[PDB]
Amino acid sequence: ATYAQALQSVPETQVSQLDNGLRVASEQSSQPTCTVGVWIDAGSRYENEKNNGAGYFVEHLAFKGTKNRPGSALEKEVESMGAHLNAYSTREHTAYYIKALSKDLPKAVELLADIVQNCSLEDSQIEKERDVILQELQENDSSMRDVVFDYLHATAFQGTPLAQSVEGPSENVRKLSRADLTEYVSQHYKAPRMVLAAAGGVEHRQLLDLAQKHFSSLSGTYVEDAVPAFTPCRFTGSEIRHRDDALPLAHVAIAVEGPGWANPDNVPLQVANAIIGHYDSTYGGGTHMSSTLASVAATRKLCQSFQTFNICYAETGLLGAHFVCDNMSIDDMMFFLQGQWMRLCTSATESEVVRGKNILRNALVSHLDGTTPVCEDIGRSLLTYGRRIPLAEWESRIAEVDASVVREVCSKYFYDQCPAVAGLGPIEQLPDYNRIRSGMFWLRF
Amino acid sequence: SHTDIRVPDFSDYRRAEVLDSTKSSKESSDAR
Amino acid sequence: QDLEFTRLPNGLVIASLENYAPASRIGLFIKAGSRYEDSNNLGTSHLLRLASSLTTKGASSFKITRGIEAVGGKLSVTSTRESMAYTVECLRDDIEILMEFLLNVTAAPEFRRWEVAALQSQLRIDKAVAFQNPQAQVLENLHAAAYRNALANSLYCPDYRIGKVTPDQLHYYVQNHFTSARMALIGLGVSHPVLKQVAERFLNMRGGLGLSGAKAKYRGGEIRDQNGDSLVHAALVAESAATGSAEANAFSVLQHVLGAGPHVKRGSNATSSLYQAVAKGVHQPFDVSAFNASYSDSGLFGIYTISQAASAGDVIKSAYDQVKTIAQGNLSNTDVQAAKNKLKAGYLMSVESSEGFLDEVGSQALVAGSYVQPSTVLQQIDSVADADVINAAKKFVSGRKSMAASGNLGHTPFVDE
Amino acid sequence: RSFLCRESLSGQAAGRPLVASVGLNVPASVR
Amino acid sequence: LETWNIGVVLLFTVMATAFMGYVLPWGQMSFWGATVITNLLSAIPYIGTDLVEWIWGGFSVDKATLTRFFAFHFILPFIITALAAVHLLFLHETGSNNPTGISSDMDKIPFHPYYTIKDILGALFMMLILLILVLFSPDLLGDPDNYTPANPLNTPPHIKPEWYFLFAYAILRSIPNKLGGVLALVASILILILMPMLHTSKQRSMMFRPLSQCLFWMLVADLITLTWIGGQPVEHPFIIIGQLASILYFLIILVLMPITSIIENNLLKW
Amino acid sequence: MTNIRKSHPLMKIINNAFIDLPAPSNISSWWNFGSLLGICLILQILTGLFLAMHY
Amino acid sequence: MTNIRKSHPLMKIINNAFIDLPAPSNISSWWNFGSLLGICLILQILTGLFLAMHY
Amino acid sequence: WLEGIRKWYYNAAGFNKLGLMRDDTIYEDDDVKEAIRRLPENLYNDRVFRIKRALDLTMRQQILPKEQWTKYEEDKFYLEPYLKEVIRERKEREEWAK
Amino acid sequence: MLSRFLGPRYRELARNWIPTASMWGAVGAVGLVWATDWRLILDWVPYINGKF
Ligand code: HEM
Ligand code: HEM
Ligand code: HEM
Numbered sequence A: 001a002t003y004a005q006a007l008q009s010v011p012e013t014q015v016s017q018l019d020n021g022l023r024v025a026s027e028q029s030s031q032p033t034c035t036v037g038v039w040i041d042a043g044s045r046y047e048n049e050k051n052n053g054a055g056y057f058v059e060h061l062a063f064k065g066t067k068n069r070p071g072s073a074l075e076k077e078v079e080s081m082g083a084h085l086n087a088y089s090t091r092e093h094t095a096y097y098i099k100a101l102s103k104d105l106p107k108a109v110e111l112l113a114d115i116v117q118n119c120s121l122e123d124s125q126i127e128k129e130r131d132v133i134l135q136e137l138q139e140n141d142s143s144m145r146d147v148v149f150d151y152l153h154a155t156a157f158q159g160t161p162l163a164q165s166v167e168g169p170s171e172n173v174r175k176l177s178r179a180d181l182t183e184y185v186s187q188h189y190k191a192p193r194m195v196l197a198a199a200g201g202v203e204h205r206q207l208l209d210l211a212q213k214h215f216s217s218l219s220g221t222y223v224e225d226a227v228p229a230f231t232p233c234r235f236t237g238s239e240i241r242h243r244d245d246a247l248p249l250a251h252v253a254i255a256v257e258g259p260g261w262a263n264p265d266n267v268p269l270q271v272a273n274a275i276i277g278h279y280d281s282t283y284g285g286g287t288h289m290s291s292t293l294a295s296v297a298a299t300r301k302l303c304q305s306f307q308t309f310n311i312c313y314a315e316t317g318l319l320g321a322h323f324v325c326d327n328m329s330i331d332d333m334m335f336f337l338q339g340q341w342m343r344l345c346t347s348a349t350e351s352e353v354v355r356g357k358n359i360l361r362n363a364l365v366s367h368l369d370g371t372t373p374v375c376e377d378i379g380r381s382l383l384t385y386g387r388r389i390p391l392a393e394w395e396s397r398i399a400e401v402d403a404s405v406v407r408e409v410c411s412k413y414f415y416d417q418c419p420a421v422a423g424l425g426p427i428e429q430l431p432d433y434n435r436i437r438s439g440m441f442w443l444r445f
Numbered sequence B: 001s002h003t004d005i006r007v008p009d010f011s012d013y014r015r016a017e018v019l020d021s022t023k024s025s026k027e028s029s030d031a032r
Numbered sequence C: 001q002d003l004e005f006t007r008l009p010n011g012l013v014i015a016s017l018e019n020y021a022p023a024s025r026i027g028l029f030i031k032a033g034s035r036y037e038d039s040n041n042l043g044t045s046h047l048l049r050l051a052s053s054l055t056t057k058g059a060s061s062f063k064i065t066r067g068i069e070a071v072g073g074k075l076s077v078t079s080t081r082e083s084m085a086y087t088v089e090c091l092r093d094d095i096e097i098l099m100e101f102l103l104n105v106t107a108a109p110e111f112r113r114w115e116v117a118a119l120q121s122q123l124r125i126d127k128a129v130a131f132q133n134p135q136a137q138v139l140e141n142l143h144a145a146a147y148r149n150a151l152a153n154s155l156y157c158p159d160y161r162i163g164k165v166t167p168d169q170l171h172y173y174v175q176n177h178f179t180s181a182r183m184a185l186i187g188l189g190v191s192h193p194v195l196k197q198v199a200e201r202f203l204n205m206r207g208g209l210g211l212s213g214a215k216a217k218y219r220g221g222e223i224r225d226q227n228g229d230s231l232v233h234a235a236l237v238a239e240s241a242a243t244g245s246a247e248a249n250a251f252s253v254l255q256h257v258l259g260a261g262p263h264v265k266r267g268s269n270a271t272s273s274l275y276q277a278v279a280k281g282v283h284q285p286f287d288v289s290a291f292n293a294s295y296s297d298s299g300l301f302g303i304y305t306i307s308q309a310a311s312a313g314d315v316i317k318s319a320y321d322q323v324k325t326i327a328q329g330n331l332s333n334t335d336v337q338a339a340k341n342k343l344k345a346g347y348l349m350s351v352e353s354s355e356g357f358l359d360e361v362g363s364q365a366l367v368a369g370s371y372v373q374p375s376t377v378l379q380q381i382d383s384v385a386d387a388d389v390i391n392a393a394k395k396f397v398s399g400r401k402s403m404a405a406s407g408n409l410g411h412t413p414f415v416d417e
Numbered sequence D: 001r002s003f004l005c006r007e008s009l010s011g012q013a014a015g016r017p018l019v020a021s022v023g024l025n026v027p028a029s030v031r
Numbered sequence E: 001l002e003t004w005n006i007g008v009v010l011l012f013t014v015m016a017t018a019f020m021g022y023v024l025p026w027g028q029m030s031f032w033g034a035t036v037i038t039n040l041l042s043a044i045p046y047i048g049t050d051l052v053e054w055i056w057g058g059f060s061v062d063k064a065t066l067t068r069f070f071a072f073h074f075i076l077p078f079i080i081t082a083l084a085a086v087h088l089l090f091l092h093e094t095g096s097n098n099p100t101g102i103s104s105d106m107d108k109i110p111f112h113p114y115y116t117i118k119d120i121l122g123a124l125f126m127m128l129i130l131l132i133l134v135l136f137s138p139d140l141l142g143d144p145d146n147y148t149p150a151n152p153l154n155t156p157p158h159i160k161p162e163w164y165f166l167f168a169y170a171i172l173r174s175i176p177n178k179l180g181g182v183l184a185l186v187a188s189i190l191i192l193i194l195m196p197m198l199h200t201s202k203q204r205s206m207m208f209r210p211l212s213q214c215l216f217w218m219l220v221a222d223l224i225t226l227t228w229i230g231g232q233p234v235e236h237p238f239i240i241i242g243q244l245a246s247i248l249y250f251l252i253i254l255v256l257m258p259i260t261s262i263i264e265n266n267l268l269k270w
Numbered sequence F, G: 001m002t003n004i005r006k007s008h009p010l011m012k013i014i015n016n017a018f019i020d021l022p023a024p025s026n027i028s029s030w031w032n033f034g035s036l037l038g039i040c041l042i043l044q045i046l047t048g049l050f051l052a053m054h055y
Numbered sequence H: 001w002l003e004g005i006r007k008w009y010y011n012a013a014g015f016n017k018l019g020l021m022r023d024d025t026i027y028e029d030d031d032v033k034e035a036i037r038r039l040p041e042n043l044y045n046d047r048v049f050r051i052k053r054a055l056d057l058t059m060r061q062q063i064l065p066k067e068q069w070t071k072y073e074e075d076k077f078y079l080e081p082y083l084k085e086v087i088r089e090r091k092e093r094e095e096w097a098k
Numbered sequence I: 001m002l003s004r005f006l007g008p009r010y011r012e013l014a015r016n017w018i019p020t021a022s023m024w025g026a027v028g029a030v031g032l033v034w035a036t037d038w039r040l041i042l043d044w045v046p047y048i049n050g051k052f
Helices: A003-007 A056-061 A074-082 A104-117 A125-140 A144-156 A179-186 A204-217 A268-276 A292-300 A327-346 A348-365 A369-386 A390-401 A403-413 A433-439 C044-050 C061-071 C092-109 C115-131 C134-146 C167-177 C194-203 C248-257 C271-278 C312-327 C333-350 C354-367 C374-382 C392-399 E001-025 E028-043 E049-058 E063-092 E110-136 E163-174 E179-200 E210-231 E239-265 F010-020 F029-052 G009-019 G029-051 H002-013 H030-039 H041-059 H077-095 I006-037
Strands: A014-018 A023-029 A033-040 A084-089 A092-099 A194-200 A240-243 A248-257 A278-280 A302-310 A317-325 A420-424 C003-007 C015-018 C023-030 C073-074 C084-090 C183-188 C222-224 C229-242 C286-292 C301-310 C401-405 E108-110 F022-024
Touching: A003 A390, A003 C092, A003 C167, A003 I006, A014 C134, A014 C374, A023 A204, A033 A104, A033 A369, A033 C333, A056 A084, A056 A092, A056 A125, A056 A179, A074 A104, A084 C248, A092 A104, A092 C333, A104 A194, A125 A144, A125 A179, A144 A240, A144 A248, A144 A317, A144 A348, A144 A420, A179 A278, A194 A204, A194 A369, A248 A302, A248 A403, A268 A302, A268 A317, A268 A327, A268 A348, A268 A390, A268 A403, A268 C084, A268 C222, A278 A292, A292 A302, A292 A327, A292 A420, A302 A327, A302 C003, A327 A403, A327 A433, A348 A390, A348 C023, A348 C061, A348 C084, A348 C092, A348 C392, A403 E063, A420 C044, C003 C194, C015 C286, C015 C354, C015 E063, C023 C092, C023 C354, C023 E049, C044 C084, C044 C115, C044 C134, C044 C167, C044 C374, C061 C084, C061 C092, C061 H077, C073 C092, C084 C092, C092 C194, C115 C134, C134 C229, C134 C401, C183 C194, C183 F010, C222 E210, C229 C248, C229 C286, C229 C312, C229 C392, C248 C271, C248 C286, C248 C301, C248 C312, C248 C374, C271 C286, C271 C312, C301 C312, C312 C392, C333 C374, C354 C392, C392 E049, E001 E028, E001 E063, E001 E179, E028 E179, E049 E063, E063 F010, E063 F029, E063 G009, E063 G029, E108 E110, E110 F010, E163 E179, E163 E210, E179 E239, E210 H002, H030 H077
Parallel strands: A023 A194, A240 A420, C015 C183, C222 C401
Antiparallel strands: A014 A023, A033 A092, A033 A194, A084 A092, A248 A317, A248 A420, A278 A302, A302 A317, C003 C015, C023 C084, C023 C183, C073 C084, C229 C301, C229 C401, C286 C301, E108 F022
């Protein structure tokens, strides 16, 4: 049973669609557990400056109380059958998923229907929840990677809804009344923009009939006329530096415009990203890792941890790197990291491209291990691509990637493109934006 | 507090083409 | 499409399952760890865990790193206080190369002097990074204050041994605790015959049961350290049973009756009796959870608590009183059913991931030596009655205690009260 | 991370013995 | 490598400066040696002729060339000083090499109390030699015909350059092909650039390499032979001796030394 | 409070050049020619000047 | 492995004196003259030399 | 035979007169420098002292008495295994980069 | 030396940098012809040859 044989044997992703529009998608297997969740297309992108932070508030109040389950009773039902209920809200998607046994499927779907629909939104709990978010804002302020990435988004997509943080400024969260949230729920928690996903010991017919008998009350209209449209977001190459010398370590994230969820150029670029690799001070590979940047960093003890990212939204993305290093390394990595990118833009050997392809295949096949990652994959893919990409298709697209393709796509996205630097901490040594932009092009090429 | 960090408007200094919510940074990158 | 559990004459147990998954993981679980560390070789296990890439006999460090990376596989050495689990994952068409790599690393190392001297700094780096989470310090001091020896030894090299672990210590540890009898070879995504071939080809050099470690004795002391953190991390435990007994399952059920780990994100733990009991009382940010640790010969059971510095004395007290109520027969059968359901779900849900299943099979092979399907585990869990939980609570309450704390201990009570 | 809320603090307690893990291309982890 | 290459550049600059300086006093030797040496650049293909007319500032070494060489001889030594400073910088980045050829980082002594006085003694000895030369026999290393006003309509019986150039001039005379002669003239100095590459011996110095020691002294004797050959006119048997010496110089540097080092390592188990 | 020998910029350069520069112990006489070159250069720069003053 | 601009000895001096030298960001045009003088010096050294070849 | 020529060469080389061993006279390139770093402490200390004594003798332009000359038979080969391993590792790196 | 630089991926890098190096050489050739004012070549370019 070779790799290829296993790929065309992975269960399918049967997809259905009720009349209201809610797309039901399941993925049967043999495990006695399951993971059923609803992936809505809410997020900070669909939020104006007046109500930014509504999605976070709604996610907070989702599990608090319902009309049918008054409150803690919902938590009691979730805990009595051993299910773990979770929710994650991002800049584009917001989802609720219950991790429960296969036998508890009829009850779990009912619980998700109650949350996404008959949410109480009691004013007393709103007031209680108002402080919690404020505390969580300070906690996130302590999370230096998160604040650096929020700086990245703010300075890259400036003047666009994407620049808005998911949690929202700590002024909107102090005025968000019940009225603002109710419009968010009635305007974004709609059936067409919803995917009921499940994976594990789930039967697609069972999921379809449970959806028909529970989520039928979901509405597809948009009240009077208001249909929140998709606003394309401009990427304005800029920089932001919040220099705080008290911070022990300096975080710098630099990213250029990457593609959207469409534009198969993601597959080559990811391979290119895999060639750059990722490093942490506790790796153990040392001065032997195949990635040139990782080997240099380990040899000279340059950084504490650098990671390459390919954050991808519907029409644009932030493709680049983020590294954590001391005060007297920030410039040096700016030399090497950029020096790495241009190498892939001018001379990418087939050997390292094969290595990147293998790394990408491993990442994809490993990330889809376990019911919860599979459910997340289904819910995210149905919203981004409109269909779950089978692993065989991923394998084919990876196979079509070679050295010339990587060079072309990198030169198309990396070469001579203004970056979106964002730095925090003792970032004095961080090269000036003109120096970074100059480093974005090579005088040999 | 990091969520309260909003970039000031640069529309005064911004260059002609890149002045809107339209993408204008990929297709007009070559021009500028 | 099933799990074979062959055992060799040497003692190696080869377990293999062909799930026809796109990827494959091979794990070598050795019954070696901190508990098998005498007073002179402390920290050797930590260095051995860190020395997963040093130059072996037939594969240099450069070749090992490059070969594992070209396939894009991963090589982890997950370790506990009683077992060290080497693990390698990659695509099923390439598993043989990294199987050879893993077998060279685990059965024929060289431990060159310069490379070990280089790894000495990684020892400290890893210890600091792992200790950035307060739970690490408290959980380590808990064993240090509970067990006289054996399990008391830390997973991390003590500060005075950083820079002193000689290669001779590593060689002694390998050819004393890596013998065939105390190892298990588990494979997910691979066929049994090839696993048997690689086993009898490489792991057969080392035979016997190896140097057996000593038993664990319950000292029942305190290790309290003050480190300025506003949050106090207290942990009060008592000698529970050892895994593989009905008492162990009773203690496990008691853990979920008391409540351990949230189930609803940003929830309130309605069913958790500890959280509800403490809530009546301190109106401040806190957390309290039952804590069960099951080892080969002994085990611990108690309460772990994160609280504000001033209110800690209440949280340790009130939560403790809650267990007292359970000891006096205040456990309704409904809570027993809820705890059994939570425990069954938690077990079935930890074998969900392929890595989780691999670790479960490795632990079963190392400790018991025979695979048990989840149905039998659930049957054993259901065999637990209320009287067994009520005992377990009696054993916890009416036994010598062991407290480990952290943070500003101005108001944290001592074990005597 | 700094924790100053019940909801954020929830789950930070420990109920299973400490288990360390290091890798070759994966950062160190603990549980 | 850096210090050695900078040294080669310094050698070229010093040789050019000395050539121009000897042109300055406008003797018979001066004028005629300048004409003979500059006329080599006519051998360069294509541009060569133009180049000569460029450097001559006209059609022959004349009024223009004298002042031009004066200005160049004035400016060049300061460039030599700058290059010497760069040379000392590069050498200090690594430290000097002892006669044994082995790193001496353990037995290092401060420069001031010891090598300043050693260098003072060296300067005293060199001043002794130079002052003997100037005070007792000044026109020993020169040529008497240089004490005659330059007359372009008559040449001296012999046209020889200064002594420190004859070693190369003989090489020039070896090859009848004029362009080949100029190329060998340049290569005779540029060989020092390739010299670091040709090093094949496991050891660094020649302290423990007797075979290479005999080879090195063969090279020194060969250079002395070329210097002697340069002075004598182009007649039997100086022509054949000059060809043999010129061949042997490159044979020793390029072939005999690396092969000797290769045999050398084999003679010592490595 | 410090040596102006090893703190003043020019004096620091001179010190690292030929005052406290670590030199090999067993340097033979053949190395003296290094300085014997520089001194010659200085002399050549000196006398040539006084020649260009009447040439 | 390392940038030549900040590892090569001569290039290190050039970098620390003309490339990565931290200069104030608000120096007016009056600070340009320090450059011009130097350039003028070069020009004076240059043209004068070409004057020395026919004077 | 050949070994007689090799012994004659060892005698005529001269590094025996200084108390030096064969490996002390080797040029210190990057491979040799890394090999020297890799040496065990007890060998490294003797290497450093032998080198320093030799430099002292050459500074005073002297040699040890004939009795304290490293004999050809007694000329051990301490740096050879470490240098061989270092060269092997470098060759592996170059072949992988190929 | 040359043993190390003779490789599959080394020739592949050479091939990658062939266009840039070749047309850098073209840059040099055009600059040399221009600065030198090489009449032999400049007599064939249409507009420029009118200068002579
Ligand atoms: C302008 C004339 C020169 C001056 C002023 C000069 C200056 C110096 C000085 C002062 C030293 C240190 C003393 C010494 O080791 O000898 C030195 C070292 C050196 N010079 Fe020169 N030098 C000149 C020409 C050359 C030439 C022509 C070469 C060869 C191409 C050269 C190559 C070296 C080398 C290799 C060293 C290091 C010697 C060692 O480490 O043992 N130099 N130079
Ligand atoms: C690099 C060091 C120098 C060398 C090797 C050098 C060499 C020479 C030589 C060989 C001559 C011809 C001597 C003769 O007539 O027989 C000469 C002449 C001359 N040099 Fe220099 N020179 C040097 C530096 C300088 C400098 C720096 C100057 C200007 C300050 C200078 C000015 C002159 C003048 C004016 C003459 C003509 C006077 C005469 O020839 O006697 N020289 N030089
Ligand atoms: C510090 C920079 C310099 C200054 C300020 C300077 C200034 C002058 C001035 C004012 C004159 C008179 C020009 C005239 O009246 O026509 C002059 C003439 C001359 N300078 Fe300079 N000079 C400098 C550098 C040099 C250098 C480096 C050289 C030699 C390479 C040189 C060679 C001459 C010569 C040969 C003349 C006479 C020809 C003439 O008068 O134009 N100068 N210089």
